[PDB]
Design a protein around this ligand. Structure first.
Ligand SMILES: *[C@@H](C(=O)N[C@H](C(=O)N1CCC[C@H]1C(=O)OC)[C@@H](C)CC)[C@H](O)C(=O)NCCC
Length: 220
């Protein structure tokens, strides 16, 4: 596999969004992965509606601001036959009744692929597919205050993920401890958090924070 990957440089990644005070991380993770696979197919990068997922994918198992799963979001897009653009169905950070309008649908998918629960398989997926939806343990103050560098949290769990984000690449940089490898992760807490909204999460450190345990992407 390549030693460094960054899908932002290939145009697969929209700007950082902000989920506000709603537990809708899963919706931003899913739109991020579908944005990348739609661009892979069509060469047009179109921001997708998280509100559409939050309001409408309950029948697939999602619970709006009370949490969800990216895979359920991908199943909703396939079941529904579409997903509206962000511009047409703007984000409101609260669950409302479903207002999907097929006329403004700009994305589709045909299923999704779950990645084996190893960082080696995640790396191969990131290298060959595009941005990947993943779930992490983001429940530590260290993660709130992250500013730069490779994020490593000794108390991070690889089994209890609470946060859906998007791996857009990986790479390396020299460090004091010589744990040099990172996943390049897009968060949904706005551009003020972290490095312009991104975090470098420790890679190849025993599936740190569970980043490889629930990874998937939509098939377009
Ligand atoms: C994922 C989720 O939304 N996470 C949630 C979160 O990001 N916020 C809660 C309110 C505003 C943000 C925040 O922390 O801003 C600083 C918390 C619980 C993360 C620490 C959602 O709970 C979910 O569906 N998780 C399951 C895995 C996809």
């Amino acid at each position: 596999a390549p030693r460094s990957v960054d899908w932002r440089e290939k145009g697969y990644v929209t700007p950082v969004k902000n989920q506000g005070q709603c537990g809708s991380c899963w919706a931003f993770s899913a739109t991020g992965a579908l944005e990348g696979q739609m661009f892979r197919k069509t060469g047009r990068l179109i921001s997708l509606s998280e509100q559409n997922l939050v309001d409408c994918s309950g029948p697939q198992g999602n619970e709006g601001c009370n949490g969800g799963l990216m895979d359920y979001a991908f199943q909703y897009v396939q079941d529904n036959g579409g997903l509206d653009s962000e511009e047409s169905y703007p984000y409101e950070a609260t669950e409302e009744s479903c207002k999907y309008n097929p006329k403004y649908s700009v994305a589709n998918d045909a299923g999704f692929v779950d990645i084996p629960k190893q960082e080696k398989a995640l790396m191969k997926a990131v290298a060959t597919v595009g941005p990947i939806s993943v779930a992490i343990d983001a429940g530590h103050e260290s993660f709130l205050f992250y500013k730069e560098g490779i994020y490593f949290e000794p108390d991070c769990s690889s089994e209890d993920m609470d946060h859906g984000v998007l791996v857009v690449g990986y790479g390396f940089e020299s460090t004091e401890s010589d744990n040099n490898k990172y996943w390049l992760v897009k968060n949904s807490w706005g551009e003020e958090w972290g490095m312009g909204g991104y975090v470098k999460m420790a890679k190849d450190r025993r599936n740190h924070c569970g980043i490889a345990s629930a990874a998937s992407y939509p098939t377009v």
